[PDB]
């Protein structure tokens, strides 16, 4: 605690396919991963039995791969069902947490599916408009002009 910088302290890490700032706290470093938020980080760290008050760069490989393994399949790790992102999938109806660019391509394929079935929400997405029924008369002029 408050020692010199550890010798195996990389300043940034490589998680899945993305890089995270090891200078910041682990509870907030992995929030850099898309699909990972502060609550998700908090719960995976608490059930990872990892001290929260240490930075990401001072971890070791076993700890970080435990974190990765929990994140990839948190169903078996007592993470409650309702806490997840991709619950009750539209393709296969299986409860899953999404962690990376799988989120990006899944969002993309959901939008193109909405367009293909020609949903009103999908058509709004196609035209770049608001889909939640907000007022477009006066607001959001920046995104077009």
């Amino acid at each position: 605690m408050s020692l010199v910088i550890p010798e195996k302290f990389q300043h940034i890490l490589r998680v899945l396919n993305t890089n995270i700032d090891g200078r910041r706290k682990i509870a907030f470093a992995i929030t850099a991963i898309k699909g990972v938020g502060r609550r998700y980080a908090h719960v995976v760290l608490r059930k990872a039995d990892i001290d929260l008050t240490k930075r990401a760069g001072e971890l070791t490989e076993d700890e970080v791969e435990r974190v990765i393994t929990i994140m990839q399949n948190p169903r078996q790790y007592k993470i409650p069902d309702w806490f997840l992102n991709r619950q009750k999938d539209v393709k296969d109806g299986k409860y899953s947490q999404v962690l990376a660019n799988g989120l990006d391509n899944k969002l993309r394929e959901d939008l193109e599916r909405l367009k293909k079935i020609r949903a009103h929400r999908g058509l709004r997405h196609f035209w770049g408009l608001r889909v939640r029924g907000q007022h477009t008369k006066t607001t959001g002029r920046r995104g077009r002009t």
Binding site: R38, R39, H42, V43, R46, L52, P80, F83
Partner: protein
Amino acid sequence: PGVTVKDVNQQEFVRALAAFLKKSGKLKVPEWVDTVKLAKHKELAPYDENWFYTRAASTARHLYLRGGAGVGSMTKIYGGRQRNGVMPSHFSRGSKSVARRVLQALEGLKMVEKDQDGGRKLTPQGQRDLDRIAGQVAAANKK
């Protein structure tokens, strides 16, 4: 020198009560302590691990202060300020099940009993426990 809980600062008093509750650990800690938020309006889980012991100690202190407080009562104490994002803020109450489970754990240690009316209060031996801890923390803060 008779010492009541009203004569010592309640903050470190409830902290010492939580510490005693931790070290005299017999609690019915639910399995969902590590995950859930403490309220609708709270936006993070509590930072400390054994927050449950602290909250149960606070509920004990409140039932010492006044009796008959139901679950909705406790959430009324444990309410908080919902910032509600871009809309103006408001007031939001506490978690019903968290308070209920704390209470159930409180009669798990038989320091809390229900009233003849609705709600629950402290038992005389729980009052004794609180008073002993108050006297000992008074001795600690004085000496």
